[PDB]
Design a protein around this ligand. Structure first.
Ligand SMILES: CCCC[C@H](NC(=O)c1[nH]c2c(c1C)C(=O)CC(C)(C)C2)C(=O)Nc1ccccc1
Ligand SMILES: CCCC[C@H](NC(=O)c1[nH]c2c(c1C)C(=O)CC(C)(C)C2)C(=O)Nc1ccccc1
Ligand SMILES: Nc1ncnc2c1ncn2[C@@H]1O[C@H](C[C@@H](N)CC[C@H](N)C(=O)O)[C@@H](O)[C@H]1O
Ligand SMILES: Nc1ncnc2c1ncn2[C@@H]1O[C@H](C[C@@H](N)CC[C@H](N)C(=O)O)[C@@H](O)[C@H]1O
Ligand SMILES: [Cl-]
Ligand SMILES: [Zn+2]
Ligand SMILES: [Zn+2]
Ligand SMILES: [Zn+2]
Ligand SMILES: [Zn+2]
Ligand SMILES: [Zn+2]
Ligand SMILES: [Zn+2]
Ligand SMILES: [Zn+2]
Ligand SMILES: [Zn+2]
Lengths: 269, 272
């Protein structure tokens, strides 16, 4: 079977680079049951707090590479190196520089807000439907893409029927919100769960600091080779609900969510 | 004899598509720093802008949106872009632009994306002889070319009334309901330095892009004629401004048909 290119760019030119779609597995057409958006949307009143005087911000006159940058000090247990790659030492939290900072738009603390830089491809997997893979080598710590979708309350997320694209922001101070990528989403909605994952989600603040709405940035957790499928750990909560409908097909020797692994965890408990 | 110094390589700190340098060959005034440069409008208290994606009118085009079937063009009061991104000649020199948005089926590089694609001409902030800072062209700018947006702090009409300095206050002129302003005094972009000319060469146009909350048009400047390198950019601030301000200073634009100079004022006062 010939792997045919079925969309030159599922993002319709909204990302820094195209994201083409191919299918060398079956006859499934390019997915169109959703609306591709490159930034989060709302379908009810969220009214994100963008008040420029609510932004914590730095006074740096350099490129924000010094530990004196307030925005880097606000970042929790993570930092960017000279090449824009994320290092880590309570989940991490990135405060990037913003429009209130004295610094320039190309300072060293602007990785996620500068967008996709790696070449990605939407492709048909053997067993998991559509997936996303790298078309280049990707060093550990590189920004990949943002989890983009429809902002909704936890109460709204609880009542939605198709929860296969629901990302819980897990707010700890205030009410809990979610990103639902079912009806509106970007390339991240197609990233599958892997028990041997190679990317990690990290909460980030950029042009607003409304604590209801951290934005979700995926970074590679190791060097990724050309052609490798991207995947992250969806988490135990996801599988505790979805394993009633399907079990994990990642096929890894490390797999923790197969029928066999679930049965073995139930006997271990 | 004073020669020209470059005193800032980019007043926008890299936030625009191109740098906007500041020069002064007239006096010792330093690079203006009594404001915060922002490349897009801000709020200091919420305006509750309607950003619900389902409220957007949007098109179904999969070409470049150059056909008469594009709903977004049909909304626009076809004004109006040509294949080069310029306003048409017979464009009404009021106009309203509905650009394509994130709900449209077209690509981000369609023909109805001019203002949202940002500054493309080369501009310079420079010290004028008699009007403080001004903005001039560093290149030929054909008629109808997008120049820049009037960017600042979105405020209510009531808030605009209580503010001390109104020299950077732009009224959005909502003929319908609630009235809002863009105040570029504390937060603004390069447009806050564009002076009044009685022979203007740019015009403001109301535009909608990522939202269609009709209370909050964004203000886009387009050239109204071919502009040559070195010409100062200017629009007609309007009589409402001058009816108030002419008691405190008169127009220094130097036009042969200046309407707001001491000479013109003296003529109008004697006619009455
Ligand atoms: C589909 C997206 C991934 C599945 C989805 N995952 C998450 O929501 C999620 N939230 C967080 C993480 C993760 C993986 C983190 O790693 C850390 C954090 C601070 C960023 C918070 C999830 O559980 N859906 C879910 C839950 C219940 C029912 C149905 C679907
Ligand atoms: C300083 C910014 C330009 C001066 C300022 N101009 C405007 O507000 C303004 N509003 C509109 C226009 C203009 C020129 C239009 O051409 C058409 C429109 C639909 C875009 C609406 C204005 O009068 N300030 C003012 C008035 C009185 C006191 C203090 C300040
Ligand atoms: N490890 C996995 N094992 C089995 N199915 C998976 C796995 N990871 C993701 N999926 C499938 O993909 C859905 C999650 C989606 N966000 C991922 C994109 C999805 N593959 C698609 O074609 O749209 C899940 O509900 C599953 O149907
Ligand atoms: N035609 C003009 N004649 C005299 N003063 C002007 C004229 N146009 C603009 N100004 C001055 O500039 C102010 C408007 C500002 N938005 C323009 C930038 C201003 N020149 C500055 O240096 O900051 C007015 O309140 C005047 O002080
Ligand atoms: Cl320059
Ligand atoms: Zn800094
Ligand atoms: Zn910075
Ligand atoms: Zn900063
Ligand atoms: Zn697995
Ligand atoms: Zn169209
Ligand atoms: Zn459109
Ligand atoms: Zn379009
Ligand atoms: Zn004049």
């Amino acid at each position: 079977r010939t792997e045919k290119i079925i969309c030159r760019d599922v993002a319709r030119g909204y990302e820094n680079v195209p994201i083409p779609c191919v299918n060398g597995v079956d006859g499934e057409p390019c997915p169109e049951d959703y609306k591709y958006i490159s930034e989060n949307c709302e379908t009810s009143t969220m009214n994100i707090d963008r008040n420029i005087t609510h932004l914590q911000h730095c006074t740096c006159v350099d490129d924000c590479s010094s530990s004196n940058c307030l925005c880097g000090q606000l970042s929790i247990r993570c930092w960017y190196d000279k090449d824009g790659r994320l290092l880590q030492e309570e989940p991490p939290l990135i405060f990037e520089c913003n429009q209130a900072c004295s610094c320039w738009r190309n300072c060293k603390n602007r990785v996620v807000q500068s967008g996709i830089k790696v070449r990605l491809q939407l492709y048909r997997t053997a067993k998991m439907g559509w997936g996303v893979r790298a078309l280049q080598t990707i060093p550990q710590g590189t920004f990949i893409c943002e989890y983009v979708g429809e902002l909704i309350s936890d109460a709204e997320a609880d009542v939605r029927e198709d929860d296969s694209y629901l990302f819980d922001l897990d707010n700890k101070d205030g009410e809990v919100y979610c990103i639902d990528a079912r009806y509106y989403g970007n390339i991240s909605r197609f990233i599958n769960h892997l028990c041997d994952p190679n990317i990690i989600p990290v909460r980030v603040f950029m042009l607003h600091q409304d604590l209801r709405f951290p934005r979700i940035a995926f970074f590679s957790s190791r060097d990724i080779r050309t052609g490798e499928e991207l995947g992250f750990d969806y988490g135990d909560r996801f599988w505790d609900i979805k394993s009633k409908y399907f079990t994990c097909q990642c096929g890894s020797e490390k797999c923790k969510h197969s029928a066999e692994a679930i049965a073995l965890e139930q006997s271990r408990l």
